[PDB]
Design a protein around this motif. Structure first.
Motif, PDB file in Angstrom:
ATOM      1  N   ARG A  38       0.838  -1.190   0.000  1.00 55.60           N
ATOM      2  CA  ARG A  38       0.000   0.000   0.000  1.00 55.60           C
ATOM      3  C   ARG A  38       0.879   1.247   0.000  1.00 55.60           C
ATOM      4  O   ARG A  38       2.099   1.176   0.161  1.00 55.60           O
ATOM      5  N   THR A  39       0.245   2.400  -0.196  1.00 54.04           N
ATOM      6  CA  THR A  39       0.951   3.658  -0.388  1.00 54.04           C
ATOM      7  C   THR A  39       0.517   4.693   0.644  1.00 54.04           C
ATOM      8  O   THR A  39      -0.491   4.536   1.340  1.00 54.04           O
ATOM      9  N   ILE A  40       1.312   5.759   0.733  1.00 51.78           N
ATOM     10  CA  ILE A  40       1.016   6.943   1.539  1.00 51.78           C
ATOM     11  C   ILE A  40       1.395   8.164   0.710  1.00 51.78           C
ATOM     12  O   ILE A  40       2.564   8.322   0.338  1.00 51.78           O
ATOM     13  N   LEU A  41       0.414   9.019   0.407  1.00 50.42           N
ATOM     14  CA  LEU A  41       0.642  10.221  -0.404  1.00 50.42           C
ATOM     15  C   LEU A  41       1.315   9.882  -1.734  1.00 50.42           C
ATOM     16  O   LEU A  41       2.171  10.618  -2.232  1.00 50.42           O
ATOM     17  N   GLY A  42       0.928   8.748  -2.310  1.00 53.26           N
ATOM     18  CA  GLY A  42       1.462   8.301  -3.580  1.00 53.26           C
ATOM     19  C   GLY A  42       2.761   7.526  -3.522  1.00 53.26           C
ATOM     20  O   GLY A  42       3.281   7.147  -4.579  1.00 53.26           O
ATOM     21  N   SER A  43       3.306   7.262  -2.340  1.00 54.23           N
ATOM     22  CA  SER A  43       4.616   6.638  -2.237  1.00 54.23           C
ATOM     23  C   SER A  43       4.528   5.257  -1.598  1.00 54.23           C
ATOM     24  O   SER A  43       3.701   5.008  -0.717  1.00 54.23           O
ATOM     25  N   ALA A  44       5.402   4.361  -2.053  1.00 53.87           N
ATOM     26  CA  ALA A  44       5.556   3.042  -1.457  1.00 53.87           C
ATOM     27  C   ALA A  44       6.720   2.972  -0.476  1.00 53.87           C
ATOM     28  O   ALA A  44       6.965   1.904   0.093  1.00 53.87           O
ATOM     29  N   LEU A  45       7.434   4.077  -0.261  1.00 52.47           N
ATOM     30  CA  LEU A  45       8.504   4.171   0.721  1.00 52.47           C
ATOM     31  C   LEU A  45       8.199   5.320   1.672  1.00 52.47           C
ATOM     32  O   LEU A  45       7.407   6.213   1.358  1.00 52.47           O
ATOM     33  N   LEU A  46       8.826   5.289   2.847  1.00 52.92           N
ATOM     34  CA  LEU A  46       8.676   6.377   3.805  1.00 52.92           C
ATOM     35  C   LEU A  46       9.609   7.529   3.427  1.00 52.92           C
ATOM     36  O   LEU A  46      10.792   7.313   3.151  1.00 52.92           O
ATOM     37  N   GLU A  47       9.078   8.750   3.410  1.00 51.22           N
ATOM     38  CA  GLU A  47       9.767   9.909   2.845  1.00 51.22           C
ATOM     39  C   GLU A  47      10.365  10.769   3.954  1.00 51.22           C
ATOM     40  O   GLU A  47       9.681  11.066   4.940  1.00 51.22           O
ATOM     41  N   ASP A  48      11.643  11.188   3.790  1.00 48.02           N
ATOM     42  CA  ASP A  48      12.284  11.981   4.837  1.00 48.02           C
ATOM     43  C   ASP A  48      12.893  13.297   4.343  1.00 48.02           C
ATOM     44  O   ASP A  48      13.711  13.886   5.047  1.00 48.02           O
ATOM     45  N   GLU A  49      12.475  13.828   3.193  1.00 48.53           N
ATOM     46  CA  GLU A  49      13.000  15.116   2.745  1.00 48.53           C
ATOM     47  C   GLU A  49      11.962  16.248   2.831  1.00 48.53           C
ATOM     48  O   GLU A  49      12.037  17.223   2.085  1.00 48.53           O
ATOM     49  N   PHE A  50      11.005  16.155   3.767  1.00 47.03           N
ATOM     50  CA  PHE A  50      10.188  17.296   4.191  1.00 47.03           C
ATOM     51  C   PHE A  50      10.395  17.545   5.687  1.00 47.03           C
ATOM     52  O   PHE A  50      10.185  16.641   6.504  1.00 47.03           O
ATOM     53  N   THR A  51      10.769  18.769   6.056  1.00 49.18           N
ATOM     54  CA  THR A  51      10.868  19.135   7.468  1.00 49.18           C
ATOM     55  C   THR A  51       9.486  19.474   8.014  1.00 49.18           C
ATOM     56  O   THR A  51       8.534  19.661   7.255  1.00 49.18           O
ATOM     57  N   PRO A  52       9.336  19.555   9.339  1.00 48.68           N
ATOM     58  CA  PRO A  52       8.064  20.067   9.884  1.00 48.68           C
ATOM     59  C   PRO A  52       7.718  21.467   9.394  1.00 48.68           C
ATOM     60  O   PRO A  52       6.531  21.779   9.220  1.00 48.68           O
ATOM     61  N   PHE A  53       8.713  22.332   9.179  1.00 52.33           N
ATOM     62  CA  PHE A  53       8.419  23.659   8.646  1.00 52.33           C
ATOM     63  C   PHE A  53       7.971  23.583   7.190  1.00 52.33           C
ATOM     64  O   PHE A  53       7.086  24.341   6.775  1.00 52.33           O
ATOM     65  N   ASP A  54       8.558  22.673   6.401  1.00 53.75           N
ATOM     66  CA  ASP A  54       8.108  22.489   5.017  1.00 53.75           C
ATOM     67  C   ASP A  54       6.625  22.132   4.958  1.00 53.75           C
ATOM     68  O   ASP A  54       5.894  22.606   4.079  1.00 53.75           O
ATOM     69  N   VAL A  55       6.170  21.274   5.872  1.00 48.52           N
ATOM     70  CA  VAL A  55       4.779  20.830   5.858  1.00 48.52           C
ATOM     71  C   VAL A  55       3.842  21.980   6.221  1.00 48.52           C
ATOM     72  O   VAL A  55       2.779  22.149   5.611  1.00 48.52           O
ATOM     73  N   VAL A  56       4.221  22.792   7.212  1.00 52.83           N
ATOM     74  CA  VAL A  56       3.392  23.931   7.608  1.00 52.83           C
ATOM     75  C   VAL A  56       3.353  24.990   6.506  1.00 52.83           C
ATOM     76  O   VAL A  56       2.299  25.588   6.245  1.00 52.83           O
ATOM     77  N   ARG A  57       4.494  25.243   5.852  1.00 57.31           N
ATOM     78  CA  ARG A  57       4.534  26.174   4.724  1.00 57.31           C
ATOM     79  C   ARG A  57       3.578  25.741   3.620  1.00 57.31           C
ATOM     80  O   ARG A  57       2.804  26.552   3.094  1.00 57.31           O
ATOM     81  N   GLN A  58       3.635  24.464   3.235  1.00 56.64           N
ATOM     82  CA  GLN A  58       2.858  24.010   2.089  1.00 56.64           C
ATOM     83  C   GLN A  58       1.382  23.859   2.429  1.00 56.64           C
ATOM     84  O   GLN A  58       0.520  24.105   1.579  1.00 56.64           O
ATOM     85  N   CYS A  59       1.068  23.452   3.655  1.00 55.99           N
ATOM     86  CA  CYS A  59      -0.323  23.287   4.038  1.00 55.99           C
ATOM     87  C   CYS A  59      -1.004  24.606   4.384  1.00 55.99           C
ATOM     88  O   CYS A  59      -2.235  24.634   4.486  1.00 55.99           O
ATOM     89  N   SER A  60      -0.245  25.690   4.552  1.00 56.17           N
ATOM     90  CA  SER A  60      -0.820  26.990   4.862  1.00 56.17           C
ATOM     91  C   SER A  60      -0.576  28.036   3.782  1.00 56.17           C
ATOM     92  O   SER A  60      -1.147  29.131   3.864  1.00 56.17           O
ATOM     93  N   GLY A  61       0.233  27.729   2.772  1.00 62.58           N
ATOM     94  CA  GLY A  61       0.438  28.640   1.657  1.00 62.58           C
ATOM     95  C   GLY A  61       1.159  29.944   1.938  1.00 62.58           C
ATOM     96  O   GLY A  61       0.714  31.002   1.473  1.00 62.58           O
ATOM     97  N   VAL A  62       2.261  29.902   2.688  1.00 59.23           N
ATOM     98  CA  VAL A  62       3.078  31.095   2.865  1.00 59.23           C
ATOM     99  C   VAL A  62       3.715  31.474   1.534  1.00 59.23           C
ATOM    100  O   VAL A  62       4.116  30.607   0.742  1.00 59.23           O
ATOM    101  N   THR A  63       3.801  32.776   1.274  1.00 52.80           N
ATOM    102  CA  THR A  63       4.408  33.299   0.060  1.00 52.80           C
ATOM    103  C   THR A  63       5.613  34.166   0.409  1.00 52.80           C
ATOM    104  O   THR A  63       5.851  34.508   1.570  1.00 52.80           O
ATOM    105  N   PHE A  64       6.383  34.515  -0.619  1.00 52.80           N
ATOM    106  CA  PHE A  64       7.614  35.271  -0.452  1.00 52.80           C
ATOM    107  C   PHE A  64       7.630  36.446  -1.421  1.00 52.80           C
ATOM    108  O   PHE A  64       6.740  36.607  -2.262  1.00 52.80           O
ATOM    109  N   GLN A  65       8.655  37.278  -1.278  1.00 51.64           N
ATOM    110  CA  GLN A  65       8.888  38.387  -2.191  1.00 51.64           C
ATOM    111  C   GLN A  65       8.970  37.892  -3.631  1.00 51.64           C
ATOM    112  O   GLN A  65       9.852  38.294  -4.387  1.00 51.64           O
TER     113      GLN A  65
END
Lengths: 306, 306
Positions: free
Chosen positions: A279-306
């Motif tokens: 089975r899969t998780i978020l489209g993957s068959a392996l466990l993923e370790d290249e998102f930090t906790p800050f990456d997840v909050v940025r992407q799930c909340s849509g922070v923008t930059f200059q």
């Protein structure tokens, strides 16, 4: 909804990439206001790389031996300096595209974006993590040395990485922008061993929370566990141990989803000891370790930059 | 060496993103020389979206009802026009950052980069494929409508996609830059079915060649097969059939690696009927279909752009 491995927009970095030539070898440099930064092995030929004496080689070169070019405009070198593994080439013009910037040294397990360049010209952008053994699993061809890694705070560009070497094992090694290598590596064409690599456990946990936020919940198990007991299992599968600092960092994700951090560790423990069973998780068959906790909050909340 | 899902550098697109406001709703627009393009449902509230009469709604609005903003600079709307599902807002200033550009309609299975934006400001960039059922598996939050997809020919930016809708199933739907939807979808908040999705077989084959180029060769099998016989197996596993056009496209990769296209199809056939059995290819436990044959040649040869 949805989740993607997203890179930072590269516009502020593209305007800073130049081509540096010293003899036959050509690589990329970074042009901030009136200084160009590039790997010092630009002064080496292929023969020199096997056993280079950089101080002796640098003395043989002069300011006029360096050709710096930005697109179709040539820059004149007014002075040169070596800072440990980087060369600083002072030129006569300040880069009018210089952004608000900062030099930072990142820690293993942190992520950043790489702008891959050839001949001073950008080819693509991708997001990666610094491995616990201080290597990166990138995509670099010949002539890509001098490509830089970066993060973007809202209006500030934080440069954290310059590419120098491909190891004989095919993984990549480089320095911060003060020229100090990440890890035990040296800029010499010799066999060099990287340490055992481990999986970044706090990043896997953040990605499991992102899975829950997006509706993947089948792995939420029936158990709980303790931090000492979790680390015992994690050490067996080459996962790095979890600290209280890592628990504090995961606080916001726990409050958003209603799932305590130690409860999520119980689900992970069962994932490790029994696998995902086709089975899969978020489209993957392996466990993923290249998102930090800050990456997840940025992407799930849509922070923008200059 | 190495292989990454690489996006195009986004600099030429960042300078074209603006914020468009018509009442309460705010979304992103694309500012090329003296025209701003945005989804027409910017004129709808949440109530209207359930059953909108766009012609009747547009007549209720005037030029002064549209607020266009780029950073901290306001643009004055001088005229408005509806082209099928896009609104064209003519403003008084030509964008001085306008790149050499082109509007193109892509075919399913082609890839492109998405610049995800909120309030007219870029948040990140990622590479994706147009699925055979004309959806995209993206990452879009509320307010990201109007974000665009693009490819870069060396000095020319080809805009191919504008985001409009998240379907109730969580997949994404949009139009080309003339406002014609990809697929059977309409810009209305109603249940809409996308077709059966299939795997893009010619893309999987290109990725297997990239694996060989980078040293992953364990899957190269002992068999060969015919195109008619391969397609019979592929139809069983929801892979799209292979044509002679697809074989011609794979020619360069076959010549670089010494492996005939039909021979690689024999390896793929065995992969499908027996799985990968707990092993990986280029770091993945699943077969990957979001790299085209051109993507593989670009990344393995290091083509650069303006």
């Amino acid at each position: 909804s949805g989740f993607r491995k997203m890179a930072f927009p590269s516009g502020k970095v593209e305007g800073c990439m130049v081509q540096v030539t010293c003899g036959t070898t050509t690589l990329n440099g970074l042009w901030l206001d009136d200084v160009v930064y590039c790997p010092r092995h630009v002064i080496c030929t292929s023969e020199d790389m096997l056993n280079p004496n950089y101080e002796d080689l640098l003395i043989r070169k002069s300011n006029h031996n360096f050709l710096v070019q930005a697109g179709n405009v040539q820059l004149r070198v007014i002075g040169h300096s070596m800072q440990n593994c980087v060369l600083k080439l002072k030129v006569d013009t300040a880069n009018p595209k210089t952004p608000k910037y900062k030099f930072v040294r990142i820690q293993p397990g942190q992520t950043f974006s790489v702008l891959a360049c050839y001949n001073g010209s950008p080819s693509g952008v991708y997001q990666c993590a610094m491995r616990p053994n201080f290597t990166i699993k990138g995509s670099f061809l010949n002539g890509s040395c001098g490509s830089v890694g970066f993060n973007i705070d809202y209006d500030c560009v934080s440069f954290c990485y310059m590419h120098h070497m491909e190891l004989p094992t095919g993984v990549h090694a480089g320095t911060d922008l003060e020229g100090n290598f990440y890890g035990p590596f040296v800029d010499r064409q010799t066999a060099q061993a990287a340490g055992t690599d481990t999986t970044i456990t706090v990043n896997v946990l953040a990605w499991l929370y992102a899975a829950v936020i997006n509706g993947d919940r089948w792995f939420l198990n029936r158990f709980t566990t303790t931090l000492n007991d979790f680390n015992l299992v994690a050490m067996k599968y080459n996962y790095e141990p979890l600290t209280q600092d890592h628990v504090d960092i995961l606080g916001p994700l726990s409050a958003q989803t209603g799932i305590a951090v130690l409860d999520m560790c119980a689900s992970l423990k069962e994932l490790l000891q029994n696998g995902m069973n086709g089975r899969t998780i978020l489209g993957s068959a392996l466990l993923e370790d290249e998102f930090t906790p800050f990456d997840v909050v940025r992407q799930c909340s849509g922070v923008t930059f200059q």
